[PDB]
RNA sequence: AGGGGAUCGAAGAUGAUCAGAUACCGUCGUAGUCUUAACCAUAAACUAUGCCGACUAGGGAUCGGGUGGUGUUUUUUUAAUGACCCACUCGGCACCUUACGAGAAAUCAAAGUCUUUGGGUUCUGGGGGGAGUAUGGUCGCAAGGCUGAAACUUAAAGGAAUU
């Protein structure tokens, strides 16, 4: 939130899930942050560079966390043919 | 409070059945509600077949078994120790 | 001495994490009441009441005291904790620790002029604990916290300057209505107000970047 | 699945659903051409005829009524139209 | 009853934990050795501690039991951790150089990796 | 039987959002539903809806982004005046900053803020936020 | 539908159902039936004078032990026999 | 009392009241 | 993407189909598992071994993303993967919970088995429900060797494979160790096969 | 009001047990239990959950119909048909596991989509007794059914669970 002069009021602008856009609550102790290492040419991971994926607690509880992760992985190019939009 | 999903016993979609009679105290109970135990016991008691075999005409081979179905009321089944109470978790067990 | 056990305790003691916001942002679990007081040194305590609870035994009762303690500074943080103990003072001491461990932040807002500082709540938020429901409707400036004295004190330690309140059910149960009110100020960030719609990069967890100062 | 294409279903999914539950409502029946032995006299016969069709030239049963698909006579040949 | 108390039970297991060979397979020889090892203020208590220890000394001879952890348990299983079958490690063996598969499994092979030995059943 | 078409469509949309689904099959079909979807698209609460056309009522498939919270209908369609708009927005919206009461009026289907500027009022359809 | 009519032209049904349902209220029945003007000894009045017929003494109900030192007074307007209560200590001596 | 026995008692009492009623009316 | 050298080689494909890893379960199959590929006449549902490889290498990248190689935790309650976890916990770092997993290693902060992991790799999620349940409370991603019928609750990364067999469980652990070791930078070239036998991770009957 | 009337059996007659037992137990036994024609309009008549419509977590079994698979078995080995196996579909009686969600809880695929309160519609309840009583109507041969109070009295009853 902002006031009239433009400085940013309200603290800790919260994160959102990468599958279904929803604010991750502070006490929502069911949401994990998936980190994927980046390979480059030689086939070795480069420490420090990660592909950050966030999944909310509700998606994990449903059991669609695996389905969502492959969709994001395939969309960003991590995986190739593990997902099918026209199921 | 409610105890079982099947309130009396095994009746969902009928509404009414022909009742049966208990074999012990002659109590009238619904056929579904009654607890039935089948008796497959032999016509002779435990052991004693060898005594029968020696005094048996023909090469034995008879060994008849009596078959009977017994219907017990809730009061008689518990009293006769045929049906015993269980815990709430064990109640759901079939 | 503290000798923290958790990774978060080691990080805050070493001085790596200097704000409670990072833990709130990353939803890092914490069970160490040193962590909360170190990052929030202006942290106060206010006990509503002590209600004994009795369990019947073979010979006499086993009277124990139940105390409700609120922990929270008046600028955006609040926490609640309930614990039973044989001694009333021990229950209060344990209640402070639990309420410290259950410190939650607040999303303040305005009834609206986009002019000053966040006084009321951003949206309407309610929480239910048993049968009691507590509605927190935003209120104009100068209205104040119109509610029961217990929840008014809890909201005054949460940083809210003005709000509207509605309650339904057996509100006389103080513990239930406190927790129900606590959930109400806990779901404020849950609401997705259209201002928080722009996409942002996901921050890397502090533990991942500070794994060197972890364990051993 | 939270992300699936309800707008372009696969062939297998559409062939499995009921005719009233597809993306667009369409029949599952078909029309067949049956010829009596010897004479051609082609005629069109529904899959579920609900009656006993006879070519007007020859008084011969070409199909028998059935609750589901009509059962054609043994001495007949069928072809999709 | 002769049910041993946990005090003599836990101490006896701790004695064998670090002292495999010291406690001999006989009661009298190691009964005084237990006194020399642990600070026991009762002659009766050390008598029962050695009795359970000697009995545990006999049982381990028959075979391993629960809660042994005697600094030598790993010695066999660190030696018995390299079975590594010499040739037939369930690969390129157990058949006539061809893998027995089915029709549907073959369609999986023709997906991307059709260059393999197949034996459709 | 089926009384209102927009009520079923909005209920299905709300259920899909609660189930974390980005799509929902709207199948009572209508023109009010289409217009109700257009005004939602104007404020970005939904994605893209494309209407499947059979020779019957029809079906609508709308892609949902994780920005909608609750969309409902106000049945019966009350005859809300121009001075009662503020009262309705004070009982159906969380805050005055956001939230749009979608009402049907003699100038078409639109939200409460546009009604104030055009100085017209009609029947109340529902609310979106 | 929450068990209630919800049409834009259905107002008589709600109005009628409200009329019968409000009769279950004790205050609604007490006011409209006007039992205070028929059966109430005071007849819808805050005070009522009378004549002290006799001095009375009643015992307390359970968990208690006292004599309340009441009085039986006949109201003037109604002419009904009504028991009263002299509140303060040592106040029966004043009355007669 | 049981509901059946209370209802039977008040029904018999109603019968007695109606029998007394028939004598005057 | 990837340098395209991580595709399923015929050597790895031959190994995977030799242990009957593609052989799934019967009609029991959750709707959350679309990896099934046709169905055998007997009733066994065939799992596409190709989708397993991309999911296997995805897990390897996730494991390699962990900076310190002790937050990785491999848990197994079934006796068919006890040796695989122990060897995986000795070749690629990580701490083993092979055998009994006490209820509270992740939540109770004063216990002698208290650890704070960043990634949990269970063998049978149905048989390791307690480990998954506690991992949910403390915000830790879960990687499971799941089958078509196995539940997917609180499981973020799935590894389609056969869990009703010592051969398949050991092979997946062996392949996961191979991929993660290459990504770390200790197994030199990615083309040369590993110098240890895949049967090392296997569990003997005695 | 007739027919029928074998077992069981409101009443009743006896045998006991018991301080008392016209109750439980035993032996008889009328009305009744069956049916014809005409009445009675009640029940824990309960799934204590009104009817219609839409959406929402999975899994298996089963009933009825339909579809497909050189599927199996069957008569004349092999056509049909029928009976089974597998897959799918529609309507059902239902069931197993979870709890997004609801509830005071017991529990619920609704008892969910209700303080983020609105799909359509009907009926009922406003503390416990008095009381479903009194009276007035109405139906019935009667027994009884429908509608249905007041005076007066009380600070408690009542529901789910914990020790």
Curated annotation (Swiss-Prot), chain A:
Keyword Magnesium set for record:
no
Q: Post-translation: what modifications?
A: N-terminally acetylated by acetyltransferase NatB.
Gene inactivation phenotype reads: Reduction in growth rate, a decrease in free 40S subunits, an increase in the amount of free 60S subunits and a decrease in polysome size.
Signal peptide limits: none
Q: Name one GO biological process term.
A: translation
Function, as annotated:
Component of the ribosome, a large ribonucleoprotein complex responsible for the synthesis of proteins in the cell. The small ribosomal subunit (SSU) binds messenger RNAs (mRNAs) and translates the encoded message by selecting cognate aminoacyl-transfer RNA (tRNA) molecules. The large subunit (LSU) contains the ribosomal catalytic site termed the peptidyl transferase center (PTC), which catalyzes the formation of peptide bonds, thereby polymerizing the amino acids delivered by tRNAs into a polypeptide chain.
Miscellaneous comment text of the record: Present with 27400 molecules/cell in log phase SD medium.
What quaternary structure, including any partners, is listed in this protein's UniProt entry?
Component of the small ribosomal subunit (SSU). Mature yeast ribosomes consist of a small (40S) and a large (60S) subunit. The 40S small subunit contains 1 molecule of ribosomal RNA (18S rRNA) and 33 different proteins (encoded by 57 genes). The large 60S subunit contains 3 rRNA molecules (25S, 5.8S and 5S rRNA) and 46 different proteins (encoded by 81 genes).
- Provide the protein name: Small ribosomal subunit protein eS21A
- Where does this protein come from, organism-wise? Saccharomyces cerevisiae (strain ATCC 204508 / S288c)
UniProtKB/Swiss-Prot annotation, chain D:
Q: Which GO terms describe its cellular component?
A: cytoplasm; cytosol; cytosolic small ribosomal subunit
Keywords assigned by UniProt, alphabetized? Cytoplasm, Metal-binding, Methylation, Ribonucleoprotein, Ribosomal protein, Zinc, Zinc-finger
Which BP terms does GO give this entry? maturation of SSU-rRNA from tricistronic rRNA transcript (SSU-rRNA, 5.8S rRNA, LSU-rRNA); ribosomal small subunit assembly; translation
Highest taxon of the source? Eukaryota
ZnF bounds (C4-type): 36-58
List, alphabetically, the InterPro entries matched.
Answer: Ribosomal_eS27, Ribosomal_eS27_Zn-bd_dom_sf, Ribosomal_zn-bd
The prosthetic group or cofactor this protein requires is: Zn(2+)
Protein's cellular compartments: Cytoplasm
In this UniProt entry, the residues modified to S-methylcysteine are 39
Which PROSITE patterns is this protein grouped with? Answer: RIBOSOMAL_S27E (PS01168)
Any note on cofactor binding? Binds 1 zinc ion per subunit.
**Molecular-function GO terms, alphabetical:** RNA binding; structural constituent of ribosome; zinc ion binding
Per the similarity annotation, which family is this? Belongs to the eukaryotic ribosomal protein eS27 family.
Binding partners and assembly:
Component of the small ribosomal subunit (SSU). Mature yeast ribosomes consist of a small (40S) and a large (60S) subunit. The 40S small subunit contains 1 molecule of ribosomal RNA (18S rRNA) and 33 different proteins (encoded by 57 genes). The large 60S subunit contains 3 rRNA molecules (25S, 5.8S and 5S rRNA) and 46 different proteins (encoded by 81 genes).
Q: Any extra detail in the entry?
A: Present with 43300 molecules/cell in log phase SD medium. There are 2 genes for eS27 in yeast.
The protein in question is named Small ribosomal subunit protein eS27A
Curated annotation (Swiss-Prot), chain H:
Q: InterPro entries attached here?
A: Ribosomal_eS32
Keyword terms, alphabetized: Cytoplasm, Ribonucleoprotein, Ribosomal protein
Predominantly, its location class is cytoplasm
Q: Quote the cellular component terms of the Gene Ontology held in the record.
A: cytosol; cytosolic large ribosomal subunit
Leader sequence residues: none
Q: Which GO terms describe its biological process?
A: cytoplasmic translation
The annotated region (Disordered) lies at 1-25
The listed locations are:
Cytoplasm
Q: Does the keyword DNA-binding apply?
A: no
User: In the record, what terms sit under GO molecular function?
Assistant: structural constituent of ribosome
| The family this protein is said to belong to | Belongs to the eukaryotic ribosomal protein eS32 family.
Question: What's its job?
Answer: Component of the ribosome, a large ribonucleoprotein complex responsible for the synthesis of proteins in the cell. The small ribosomal subunit (SSU) binds messenger RNAs (mRNAs) and translates the encoded message by selecting cognate aminoacyl-transfer RNA (tRNA) molecules. The large subunit (LSU) contains the ribosomal catalytic site termed the peptidyl transferase center (PTC), which catalyzes the formation of peptide bonds, thereby polymerizing the amino acids delivered by tRNAs into a polypeptide chain.
Q: How does it assemble?
A: Component of the small ribosomal subunit (SSU). Mature yeast ribosomes consist of a small (40S) and a large (60S) subunit. The 40S small subunit contains 1 molecule of ribosomal RNA (18S rRNA) and 33 different proteins (encoded by 57 genes). The large 60S subunit contains 3 rRNA molecules (25S, 5.8S and 5S rRNA) and 46 different proteins (encoded by 81 genes).
User: Other comments?
Assistant: Present with 11900 molecules/cell in log phase SD medium.
Can you say what this protein is called?
Small ribosomal subunit protein eS32A
Curated annotation (Swiss-Prot), chain I:
The annotated consequence of gene deletion is: Reduction in growth rate, a decrease in free 40S subunits, an increase in the amount of free 60S subunits and a decrease in polysome size.
What GO molecular function annotations does the UniProt record carry, in alphabetical order? Answer: structural constituent of ribosome
Residues bearing N-acetylserine are 1
**Which compartments does it reside in?**
Cytoplasm
State whether keyword NAD applies.
no
Keyword terms, alphabetized = Acetylation, Cytoplasm, Ribonucleoprotein, Ribosomal protein, Ribosome biogenesis, rRNA processing
What main location does UniProt list? cytoplasm
Q: Which GO terms describe its cellular component?
A: 90S preribosome; cytoplasmic stress granule; cytosol; cytosolic small ribosomal subunit
Query: Any other comment in the entry?
Result: Present with 93700 molecules/cell in log phase SD medium.
Provide the function of this protein.
Component of the ribosome, a large ribonucleoprotein complex responsible for the synthesis of proteins in the cell. The small ribosomal subunit (SSU) binds messenger RNAs (mRNAs) and translates the encoded message by selecting cognate aminoacyl-transfer RNA (tRNA) molecules. The large subunit (LSU) contains the ribosomal catalytic site termed the peptidyl transferase center (PTC), which catalyzes the formation of peptide bonds, thereby polymerizing the amino acids delivered by tRNAs into a polypeptide chain.
Query: Which protein family is named in the record?
Result: Belongs to the universal ribosomal protein uS2 family.
- Report what the protein is called: Small ribosomal subunit protein uS2A
Which residues of the whole protein does the chain here span?
2 to 207 of 252
């Amino acid at each position: 939130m902002e006031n009239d002069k433009g400085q940013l009021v309200e603290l800790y602008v919260p994160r959102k899930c990468s599958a279904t856009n929803r604010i991750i609550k502070a006490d929502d102790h069911a949401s994990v942050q998936i980190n994927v290492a980046k390979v480059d040419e030689e086939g070795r991971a480069i420490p420090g560079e990660y592909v950050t994926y966030a999944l909310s607690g509700y998606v994990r509880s449903r059991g669609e966390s695996d389905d969502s992760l492959n969709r994001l992985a395939q969309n960003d190019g991590l995986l190739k043919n593990v997902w099918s939009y026209s199921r | 409070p409610k105890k079982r999903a099947s309130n009396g016993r095994n009746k969902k979609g009928r509404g009414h059945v022909k009742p049966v009679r208990c074999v012990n105290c002659s109590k009238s109970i619904p056929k579904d509600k009654a607890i039935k135990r089948m008796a497959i016991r032999n016509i002779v008691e435990a052991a004693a077949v060898r005594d029968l075999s020696e005094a048996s005409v023909y090469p034995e081979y008879a060994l008849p078994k009596t078959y009977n179905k017994l219907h017990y009321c809730v009061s008689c089944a518990i009293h006769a120790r045929i049906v015993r109470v269980r815990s709430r978790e064990d109640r759901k067990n079939r | 001495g503290w000798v923290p056990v958790t990774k978060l305790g080691r990080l805050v003691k070493a001085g790596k994490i200097t704000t409670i916001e990072e833990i709130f942002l990353h939803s890092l679990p914490v069970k160490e009441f040193q962590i909360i007081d170190t990052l929030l040194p202006g942290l106060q305590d206010e006990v509503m009441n002590i209600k004994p609870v009795q369990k019947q035994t073979r010979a006499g009762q086993r009277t124990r005291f139940k105390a409700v303690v609120v922990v929270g500074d008046s600028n955006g943080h609040v926490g609640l904790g309930i614990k039973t103990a044989k001694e009333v003072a021990g229950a209060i001491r344990a209640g402070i620790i639990i309420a410290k461990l259950s410190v939650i932040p607040i999303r303040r807002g305005y009834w609206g002029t986009n002019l000053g500082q966040p006084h009321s709540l951003a949206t309407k938020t309610t929480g239910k604990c048993g049968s009691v429901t507590v509605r927190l409707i935003p209120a104009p400036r100068g209205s104040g916290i119109v509610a029961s004295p217990a929840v008014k004190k809890l909201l005054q330690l949460a940083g809210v300057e003005d709000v509207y309140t509605q309650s339904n059910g057996k509100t006389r149960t103080l513990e239930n209505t406190l927790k129900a009110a606590f959930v109400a100020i806990g779901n404020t960030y849950g609401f997705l107000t259209p201002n928080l719609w722009a996409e942002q990069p996901l921050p890397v967890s502090p533990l991942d970047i500070y794994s060197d100062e972890a364990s051993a | 699945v939270l992300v699936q294409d309800l707008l372009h279903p696969t062939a297998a999914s559409e062939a499995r659903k009921h005719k009233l539950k597809t993306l667009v409502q369409g029949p599952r029946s078909y029309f067949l051409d049956v010829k009596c032995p010897g004479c051609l006299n082609i005629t069109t016969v529904f899959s579920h005829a609900q009656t006993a069709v006879t070519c007007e030239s020859c008084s011969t049963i070409l199909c028998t009524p059935t609750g589901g698909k009509a059962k054609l006579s043994e001495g007949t040949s069928f072809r999709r139209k | 009853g002769r049910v041993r108390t946990k005090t003599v039970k836990r101490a006896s297991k701790a004695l064998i934990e670090r002292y495999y060979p010291k406690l001999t397979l006989d009661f009298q020889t190691n009964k005084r050795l237990c006194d020399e090892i642990a600070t026991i203020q009762s002659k009766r208590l050390r008598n029962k501690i050695a009795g359970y220890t000697t009995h545990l000394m006999k049982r381990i001879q028959k075979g391993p039991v629960r809660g042994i952890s005697f600094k030598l348990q790993e010695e066999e299983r660190e030696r018995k951790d390299q079975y590594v079958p010499e040739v037939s490690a369930l690969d390129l063996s157990r058949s006539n150089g061809v893998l027995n598969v089915d029709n549907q499994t073959s369609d999986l092979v023709k997906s991307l990796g059709l260059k393999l030995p197949l034996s459709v059943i | 039987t089926r009384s209102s078409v927009l009520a079923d469509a909005l209920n299905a949309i709300n259920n899909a959002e609660k189930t974390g689904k980005r799509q929902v099959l709207i199948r009572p079909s209508s023109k009010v539903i289409i217009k109700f979807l257009q005004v939602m698209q104007k404020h970005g609460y939904i994605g893209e809806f494309e209407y499947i056309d059979d020779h019957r009522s029809g079906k609508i498939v709308v892609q949902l982004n994780g920005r909608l919270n609750k969309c409902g209908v106000i049945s019966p369609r009350f005859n809300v005046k121009i001075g009662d708009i503020e009262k309705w927005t004070a009982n159906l919206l969380p805050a005055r900053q956001f939230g749009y009461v979608i009402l049907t009026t003699s100038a078409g289907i639109m939200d409460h803020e546009e009604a104030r500027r055009k100085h017209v009022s009609g029947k109340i359809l529902g609310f979106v936020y | 539908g929450k068990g209630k009519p919800r049409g834009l032209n259905s107002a008589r049904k709600l109005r009628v159902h409200r009329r019968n349902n409000r009769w279950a209220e004790n205050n609604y029945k007490k006011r409209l039936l006007g039992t205070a003007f028929k059966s109430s000894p005071f007849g819808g009045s805050s005070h009522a004078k009378g004549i002290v017929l006799e001095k009375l003494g009643i015992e307390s109900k359970q968990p208690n032990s006292a004599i309340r030192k009441c009085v039986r007074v006949q109201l003037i307007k109604n002419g009904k026999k009504v028991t009263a209560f002299v509140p303060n200590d040592g106040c029966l001596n004043f009355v007669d | 009392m049981r509901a059946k026995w209370r209802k039977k008692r008040t029904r018999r009492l109603k019968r007695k009241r109606r029998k007394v009623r028939a004598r005057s009316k | 993407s990837l340098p395209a050298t991580f595709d399923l080689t015929p050597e790895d494909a031959q190994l995977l189909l030799a242990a009957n890893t593609h052989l799934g379960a019967r009609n029991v199959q959750v709707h959350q598992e679309p990896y099934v590929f046709n169905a055998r006449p007997d009733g066994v549902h065939v799992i596409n071994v190709g989708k397993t490889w991309e999911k296997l290498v995805l897990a390897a990248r996730i494991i390699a993303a962990i900076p310190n190689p002790e937050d990785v935790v491999a848990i197994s309650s079934r006796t068919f993967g006890q040796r695989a976890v122990l060897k995986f916990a000795a070749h690629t770092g990580a701490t083993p919970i092979a055998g009994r997993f006490t209820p509270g290693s992740f939540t109770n902060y004063i216990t002698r088995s208290f650890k704070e992991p960043r990634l949990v790799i269970v063998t049978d999620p149905r048989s390791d429900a307690q480990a998954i349940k506690e991992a949910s409370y403390v915000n830790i991603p879960v990687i499971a060797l799941t089958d078509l019928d196995s539940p997917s609750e609180f499981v973020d990364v799935a590894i389609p494979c056969n869990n009703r067999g010592k051969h398949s469980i050991g092979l997946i652990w062996y392949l996961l160790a191979r991929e993660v070791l290459r990504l770390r930078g200790a197994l030199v070239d990615r083309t040369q096969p590993w110098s240890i036998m895949p049967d090392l991770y296997f569990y003997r009957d005695p």
